[PDB]
Coordinates of C-alpha atoms and ligand atoms in Angstrom, one line a residue:
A11 CA 0.1 0.1 0.2
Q12 CA 1.4 3.5 -0.8
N13 CA 2.0 5.9 1.9
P14 CA 1.0 3.7 4.8
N15 CA 2.2 6.5 7.5
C16 CA 0.1 8.8 5.8
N17 CA 2.6 11.6 5.2
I18 CA 1.7 14.8 3.5
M19 CA 3.4 14.5 0.2
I20 CA 4.3 17.4 -2.2
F21 CA 4.2 17.3 -6.0
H22 CA 6.3 19.3 -8.7
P23 CA 4.2 18.5 -12.0
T24 CA 6.0 19.5 -15.1
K25 CA 4.1 22.1 -17.7
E26 CA 3.0 18.6 -19.4
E27 CA 1.7 17.0 -16.3
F28 CA -0.2 20.3 -15.5
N29 CA -2.5 20.2 -18.4
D30 CA -5.3 17.8 -17.1
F31 CA -6.4 18.6 -13.8
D32 CA -8.3 15.4 -13.1
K33 CA -5.7 13.0 -14.4
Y34 CA -2.7 14.5 -12.1
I35 CA -5.3 14.3 -8.8
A36 CA -5.6 10.5 -10.0
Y37 CA -1.8 10.5 -10.3
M38 CA -1.6 11.8 -7.1
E39 CA -3.7 9.4 -5.4
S40 CA -2.0 6.4 -7.4
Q41 CA 0.9 7.5 -4.8
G42 CA -1.0 7.3 -1.9
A43 CA -1.5 11.5 -1.2
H44 CA -5.1 11.1 -0.1
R45 CA -4.2 9.0 2.8
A46 CA -2.7 12.2 4.6
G47 CA -6.1 14.1 3.8
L48 CA -4.0 17.0 2.3
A49 CA -1.4 17.7 -0.6
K50 CA 0.9 20.5 -1.6
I51 CA 1.1 20.9 -5.4
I52 CA 4.0 23.6 -6.6
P53 CA 3.2 24.6 -10.3
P54 CA 5.8 24.6 -12.9
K55 CA 7.9 27.6 -12.9
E56 CA 6.3 28.9 -16.4
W57 CA 2.8 29.2 -15.0
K58 CA 1.4 32.2 -13.5
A59 CA -2.1 32.6 -11.9
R60 CA -2.2 36.4 -12.8
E61 CA 0.3 39.1 -14.5
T62 CA -0.3 41.4 -11.7
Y63 CA -1.9 41.9 -8.6
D64 CA -2.3 45.7 -9.0
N65 CA -5.4 47.2 -8.1
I66 CA -6.6 44.3 -5.7
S67 CA -7.4 47.1 -3.0
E68 CA -10.7 47.9 -5.1
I69 CA -12.1 44.5 -4.0
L70 CA -14.8 45.1 -1.3
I71 CA -15.2 43.1 1.8
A72 CA -18.6 43.5 2.5
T73 CA -18.8 41.9 5.8
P74 CA -15.5 41.5 7.5
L75 CA -15.7 39.1 10.4
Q76 CA -13.8 39.2 14.1
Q77 CA -13.1 36.4 15.3
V78 CA -13.7 35.9 19.0
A79 CA -12.3 33.0 21.1
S80 CA -13.7 31.2 24.4
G81 CA -12.0 28.5 26.4
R82 CA -8.3 27.6 26.8
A83 CA -5.3 28.5 24.7
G84 CA -5.4 24.8 23.5
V85 CA -9.0 24.2 23.5
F86 CA -11.4 27.1 22.3
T87 CA -14.2 27.7 20.1
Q88 CA -14.5 30.9 18.2
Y89 CA -17.6 33.1 16.9
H90 CA -17.8 35.7 14.3
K91 CA -18.8 39.1 14.9
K92 CA -19.8 41.0 12.0
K93 CA -18.0 44.3 11.2
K94 CA -18.5 47.3 8.8
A95 CA -17.9 46.9 5.2
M96 CA -14.2 47.8 4.0
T97 CA -12.2 48.0 0.9
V98 CA -9.2 45.3 0.4
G99 CA -7.0 48.4 0.6
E100 CA -8.3 49.5 4.2
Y101 CA -8.4 45.8 5.3
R102 CA -4.7 45.4 4.2
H103 CA -3.7 48.6 5.9
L104 CA -5.6 47.4 9.2
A105 CA -3.5 43.9 9.1
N106 CA -0.2 45.5 8.8
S107 CA -1.2 48.2 11.8
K108 CA 0.7 47.9 15.3
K109 CA -2.5 46.2 16.5
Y110 CA -2.7 43.5 14.2
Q111 CA 0.5 43.0 12.5
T112 CA 2.7 39.7 12.9
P113 CA 5.3 39.9 15.6
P114 CA 9.2 39.8 15.5
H115 CA 9.9 36.0 15.2
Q116 CA 12.8 33.6 14.8
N117 CA 11.1 31.0 12.0
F118 CA 8.0 29.2 11.5
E119 CA 8.6 27.3 14.4
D120 CA 8.6 30.2 16.9
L121 CA 5.7 31.6 15.3
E122 CA 3.4 28.6 15.7
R123 CA 4.1 28.5 19.3
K124 CA 3.3 32.2 19.5
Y125 CA 0.1 31.6 17.9
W126 CA -1.0 28.4 20.0
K127 CA 0.1 30.6 23.2
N128 CA -1.8 33.9 22.6
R129 CA -4.3 33.3 19.9
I130 CA -7.3 33.3 22.3
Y131 CA -6.3 36.9 23.8
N132 CA -6.9 38.8 20.3
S133 CA -9.8 38.8 18.0
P134 CA -8.2 39.3 14.4
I135 CA -10.7 40.1 11.5
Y136 CA -10.8 38.5 8.1
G137 CA -12.9 38.4 4.9
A138 CA -14.3 35.2 4.2
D139 CA -16.3 33.4 1.2
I140 CA -16.4 36.3 -0.9
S141 CA -17.6 35.2 -4.4
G142 CA -15.0 35.9 -7.0
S143 CA -11.7 35.0 -8.7
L144 CA -8.2 36.7 -9.1
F145 CA -7.0 34.2 -12.1
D146 CA -6.7 35.8 -15.3
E147 CA -9.0 34.6 -18.0
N148 CA -6.3 33.4 -20.0
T149 CA -4.6 31.4 -17.5
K150 CA -5.8 27.8 -18.9
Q151 CA -4.4 25.3 -16.6
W152 CA -5.8 24.9 -12.9
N153 CA -8.0 28.1 -13.3
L154 CA -10.2 27.5 -10.4
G155 CA -12.8 29.5 -12.0
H156 CA -12.8 27.1 -15.1
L157 CA -12.6 23.9 -13.2
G158 CA -15.7 21.2 -14.2
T159 CA -18.3 21.4 -11.7
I160 CA -19.8 18.9 -8.9
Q161 CA -23.0 19.0 -10.8
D162 CA -21.6 17.7 -13.8
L163 CA -19.6 15.2 -12.2
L164 CA -22.9 14.1 -10.4
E165 CA -24.6 14.0 -13.6
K166 CA -21.8 11.8 -15.3
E167 CA -21.5 9.0 -12.7
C168 CA -25.0 8.8 -11.7
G169 CA -27.0 9.9 -14.8
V170 CA -29.1 12.3 -13.1
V171 CA -30.0 15.9 -14.1
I172 CA -29.9 18.6 -11.2
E173 CA -29.8 22.4 -10.6
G174 CA -26.9 24.1 -9.1
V175 CA -23.8 25.9 -9.9
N176 CA -19.8 25.8 -8.4
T177 CA -18.1 28.9 -8.1
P178 CA -14.8 29.8 -6.3
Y179 CA -14.4 32.4 -3.3
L180 CA -11.9 34.3 -2.2
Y181 CA -10.4 35.0 1.4
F182 CA -8.5 38.0 2.9
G183 CA -6.6 37.2 6.4
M184 CA -4.1 38.6 8.6
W185 CA -1.9 37.4 11.7
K186 CA -3.9 34.6 13.7
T187 CA -7.0 34.4 11.3
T188 CA -8.1 31.0 12.1
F189 CA -9.8 28.4 10.1
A190 CA -11.6 25.7 12.5
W191 CA -11.7 21.8 12.3
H192 CA -13.9 20.5 9.7
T193 CA -14.2 18.4 6.4
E194 CA -15.8 19.9 3.4
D195 CA -19.6 20.0 2.9
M196 CA -20.3 16.5 1.7
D197 CA -17.3 15.5 2.1
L198 CA -15.8 17.1 -1.1
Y199 CA -12.5 17.6 -2.3
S200 CA -11.2 21.4 -1.9
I201 CA -8.3 22.9 -3.4
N202 CA -6.8 26.2 -2.5
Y203 CA -4.3 28.9 -4.0
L204 CA -2.5 31.4 -2.3
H205 CA -2.6 34.2 -4.4
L206 CA -0.4 36.9 -2.5
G207 CA 1.2 37.5 0.9
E208 CA 2.3 35.5 4.1
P209 CA 2.0 31.9 4.6
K210 CA -0.9 29.8 5.8
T211 CA -0.3 26.6 8.3
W212 CA -2.4 23.9 7.9
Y213 CA -3.2 20.9 10.4
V214 CA -4.7 17.5 8.8
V215 CA -5.8 14.2 10.2
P216 CA -5.8 11.2 7.9
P217 CA -9.4 10.4 6.5
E218 CA -8.8 6.7 7.8
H219 CA -8.7 8.3 11.2
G220 CA -11.6 11.1 11.2
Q221 CA -13.9 9.4 13.6
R222 CA -11.0 9.6 16.4
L223 CA -10.8 13.3 16.0
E224 CA -14.7 13.3 16.3
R225 CA -14.8 11.4 19.2
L226 CA -12.3 13.7 20.8
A227 CA -14.3 17.0 19.9
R228 CA -17.4 15.5 21.5
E229 CA -15.3 14.9 25.0
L230 CA -13.7 18.5 24.8
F231 CA -16.7 20.5 23.7
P232 CA -19.6 18.5 25.7
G233 CA -22.3 21.5 25.5
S234 CA -21.7 22.1 21.6
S235 CA -21.9 18.3 21.1
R236 CA -25.2 17.8 22.8
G237 CA -27.0 20.1 20.4
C238 CA -25.8 18.4 17.4
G239 CA -23.9 15.0 16.6
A240 CA -22.3 16.9 13.5
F241 CA -21.3 20.0 15.1
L242 CA -18.0 20.2 13.7
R243 CA -19.5 21.2 10.9
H244 CA -20.6 24.5 12.8
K245 CA -16.8 25.4 11.7
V246 CA -15.9 26.9 15.4
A247 CA -13.8 24.3 17.4
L248 CA -10.2 24.7 17.6
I249 CA -7.9 21.8 19.4
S250 CA -4.2 22.6 19.4
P251 CA -1.4 20.0 18.2
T252 CA -0.3 19.8 21.9
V253 CA -3.6 18.5 23.0
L254 CA -4.0 16.4 19.7
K255 CA -0.7 14.6 20.5
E256 CA -1.5 13.9 24.5
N257 CA -4.9 12.6 23.1
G258 CA -3.4 10.2 20.6
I259 CA -4.9 11.4 17.5
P260 CA -2.6 11.4 14.5
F261 CA -1.8 14.5 12.5
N262 CA 0.4 16.4 10.2
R263 CA 1.0 19.7 9.4
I264 CA 2.7 21.8 6.5
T265 CA 3.0 25.6 5.7
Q266 CA 1.7 27.1 2.1
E267 CA 3.4 29.8 0.8
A268 CA 2.5 32.3 -2.2
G269 CA 2.4 30.5 -5.5
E270 CA 1.5 26.9 -3.9
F271 CA -1.9 25.2 -4.2
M272 CA -3.0 22.7 -1.8
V273 CA -5.7 20.0 -2.0
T274 CA -7.8 18.7 0.9
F275 CA -9.2 15.0 0.3
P276 CA -12.7 13.5 1.0
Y277 CA -13.1 13.4 4.8
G278 CA -9.6 14.6 5.8
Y279 CA -10.4 17.0 8.8
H280 CA -8.2 20.2 8.5
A281 CA -7.9 23.6 10.5
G282 CA -5.2 26.4 10.3
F283 CA -4.0 29.9 10.7
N284 CA -2.3 32.7 8.5
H285 CA 0.9 34.1 9.3
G286 CA 0.2 37.8 8.0
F287 CA -1.9 39.6 5.5
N288 CA -2.7 37.3 2.4
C289 CA -5.3 36.9 -0.1
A290 CA -6.1 33.1 -1.0
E291 CA -9.2 31.6 -3.6
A292 CA -10.5 28.1 -2.9
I293 CA -13.5 25.9 -4.4
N294 CA -14.8 22.7 -3.8
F295 CA -14.5 19.7 -6.7
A296 CA -15.6 16.2 -7.0
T297 CA -14.0 12.9 -8.8
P298 CA -15.4 9.7 -9.3
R299 CA -13.9 8.3 -6.0
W300 CA -15.9 11.0 -4.0
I301 CA -19.2 9.6 -4.8
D302 CA -19.3 7.0 -2.0
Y303 CA -17.9 9.7 0.6
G304 CA -20.7 11.9 -0.8
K305 CA -23.4 8.9 -0.1
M306 CA -22.2 8.4 3.8
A307 CA -21.4 12.0 4.5
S308 CA -22.7 13.1 8.1
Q309 CA -24.9 16.1 7.8
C310 CA -25.8 19.0 10.6
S311 CA -29.7 19.3 10.8
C312 CA -29.8 21.3 13.9
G313 CA -29.9 24.8 12.2
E314 CA -26.4 26.2 12.5
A315 CA -24.7 24.9 9.7
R316 CA -26.5 26.9 7.1
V317 CA -25.2 25.9 3.6
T318 CA -25.3 26.5 0.1
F319 CA -28.6 26.1 -2.3
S320 CA -26.0 24.1 -4.5
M321 CA -26.1 21.3 -1.7
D322 CA -29.9 20.7 -1.7
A323 CA -29.6 18.5 -4.8
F324 CA -26.6 16.5 -3.6
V325 CA -28.5 15.4 -0.4
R326 CA -31.7 15.0 -2.5
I327 CA -30.0 12.6 -4.8
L328 CA -27.1 10.9 -2.5
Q329 CA -29.0 10.6 0.9
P330 CA -32.8 10.4 0.2
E331 CA -33.7 9.0 3.5
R332 CA -31.7 12.0 5.1
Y333 CA -33.1 14.7 2.9
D334 CA -36.5 15.9 4.7
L335 CA -34.9 16.0 8.0
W336 CA -31.8 18.1 6.6
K337 CA -34.5 20.2 5.0
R338 CA -36.0 21.1 8.1
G339 CA -33.1 22.1 9.5
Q340 CA -31.9 24.3 6.6
Ligands
CQT401 O1 -13.5 25.1 3.8 C1 -13.2 26.0 4.6 N1 -14.3 26.9 4.4 C2 -15.4 26.8 4.3 C3 -16.1 27.2 3.2 C4 -17.7 27.3 2.8 N2 -18.1 26.7 1.7 C5 -19.7 26.6 1.6 C6 -20.2 28.0 1.6 O2 -19.8 28.8 0.5 C7 -18.3 28.9 0.6 C8 -17.7 27.6 0.7 C9 -11.6 26.4 4.4 C10 -11.0 27.6 4.8 C11 -10.0 28.0 4.6 C12 -9.4 29.2 5.0 N3 -8.4 29.6 4.1 N4 -7.9 30.9 4.8 N5 -9.1 31.1 5.8 N6 -9.9 30.1 5.7 C13 -9.1 26.9 4.7 C14 -9.6 25.4 4.8 N7 -10.9 25.2 4.7
CL402 CL1 2.0 37.2 19.4
NI403 NI1 -11.8 23.4 4.3
ZN404 ZN1 -25.5 21.2 13.6

């Protein structure tokens, strides 16, 4: 079996290998990449996402979110407090101000130590899930706005015809901006491109051990767990690497730099944080291997995890027994 220890693998495709997205995902899986839950792809040197990031400051962040924590340094939840709209220009200036700027630090390890020690005592602000794309129209390989849609995959594999669209989203982050432990909706894949700015650190649990993380989260967040079996889909819970190690949870970590793609695989739980001002783009996608994960994915039906209208058809076709209850929760 390939990649039995479930290590995060890093790939360096040639321009020739970068010309067929689904073929290269399948190649990475033939080498065991999916067993880690996450892989890094470094594009060939000749490729570029866009020629210049001039004027990015004109994009509007309609509802910036302030991430307020509760709990202890290694085990906390975060809630989002809505802020007034700001442009990316205003947001970048805020990210770089004394209150929010990255602190002096020796290396990535020192910065990670500072994050887990101090995150709960600050409330960083970020822009999340902004529909849009920063790829140039003339970028033909790995353009997240021109990938095959999840609907077309489902129609090809199952012979069904469904409504819905699949479009990319932008994220603007700053030091300590945090993404909570989660898998994707319907346990889909995701792909994330870091367009500009400072790095993003990722943590990931192998899909074959995802239930261990779920059991620990129930133990550590008992009130939250009681409302909803699938409360990790609320995307509110953080658990540090030290606490994961104390409790025997298998995981890995890797840092993504500007110009690099990260792919998350079906049922790979992930979390992480930004080092400083940056801009990323992400979209969900599917392959034939995803279908059996989609059929078995847990659902939040308690109200909290309000989803996209695209997800209705996925539940309706793949999980008919669950559909009515899930709908009541929407
Ligand atoms: O999957 C993630 N977020 C949830 C997407 C919600 N769906 C459903 C609603 O429409 C947008 C897509 C995520 C975010 C980040 C991240 N990177 N920088 N900040 N956060 C990293 C890894 N995963
Ligand atoms: Cl700090
Ligand atoms: Ni994600
Ligand atoms: Zn719920």
